[PDB]
């Protein structure tokens, strides 16, 4: 059944969710802080993360100030980084919101649809599919985008489907 | 098309909707506060309600401290309260969190979906249904079980139809 999980994840530090994430479902990142000026990355200032079981990067979201960007990407544990989506200008997705800011992916099963604040940033298709098992939010106390603390709250058992039959 | 919409409604006031809720739709409101002994309400400490385009309350939840009890119910607004659902131990249902809370009413259609926190409350069966156009939030400033300002986020369009051709 429909169910909601909340989950407080420190900067450098990630999560096992006792409800998995799979298509239909939700989760969303609360920030507390809204830091578009912060120190500089190495390169990256804040990264969110979906992973898999096998320890997989089902997405990889990453937010560079210095490079004024946020990259979406996945990859396997042992292999390499796959094809990047690009998304210019970080303080412009988060324009209208400011002292706080959220962040939510759907899994729409062949694709992730990533929302900032308000506005839909891009619809990633997927380059490696399955159930998301844990969550992380990485970066330092010195040069992130985001509080020291993010809650993550995931919306989980969702999905439902009207079927339509023609012949 | 599924999309997210934020609002922040202030005690004693209502928001209309960007994107209306619906079956399969979800809304939460979160709040900063969590102050399970603000003293008795009058008779409400804090109400949070989902309203239909023509301004019936959809559903109606109500928390009381001095009865230890959180509400729900529905009516028309020329008409009067119906059949009142109760849910006793206020503290119980917040328990775990400290400091803020959230509050999730899913719309299953035919029923609503409430839970507090992680929390299901209960399963309410409508007594009227619909697409909910606004929401509202009540209370006073000294007596409300959460934060002056509650941010009341929306997750909608996430129903699907899948065409099967044979």
Redesign the interface.
């Known amino acids: 059944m429909?169910?909601?999980?909340?989950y407080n994840i420190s900067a450098g530090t990630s999560v096992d969710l006792a409800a998995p994430v799979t298509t239909?479902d939700?989760v969303?990142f609360?920030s507390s802080a809204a830091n578009l000026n912060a120190g500089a990355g190495n390169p990256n200032n804040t990264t969110l993360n979906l992973f898999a079981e096998n320890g997989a990067y089902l997405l990889h979201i990453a937010f560079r100030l210095q490079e004024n960007v946020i990259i979406f990407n996945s990859r396997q544990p042992d292999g390499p980084w796959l094809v990047e989506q690009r998304v210019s200008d970080v303080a412009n997705q988060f324009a209208g919101?400011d002292g706080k800011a959220?962040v939510?992916v759907?899994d729409?099963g062949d694709k992730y649809?990533v929302?900032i604040?308000?506005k839909?940033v891009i619809q990633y298709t997927k380059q490696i599919s399955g159930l998301t098992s844990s969550l992380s939010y990485n970066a330092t106390e010195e040069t992130s985008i985001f509080s020291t603390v993010v809650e993550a709250?995931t919306?989980t058992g969702?999905a439902?489907?009207?079927?339509?039959?023609?012949?």
């Open positions: 429909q169910g909601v999980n909340i239909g939700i969303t609360f919101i959220m939510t759907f729409h649809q929302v604040n308000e839909t709250v919306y969702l439902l489907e009207h079927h339509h039959h023609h012949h």
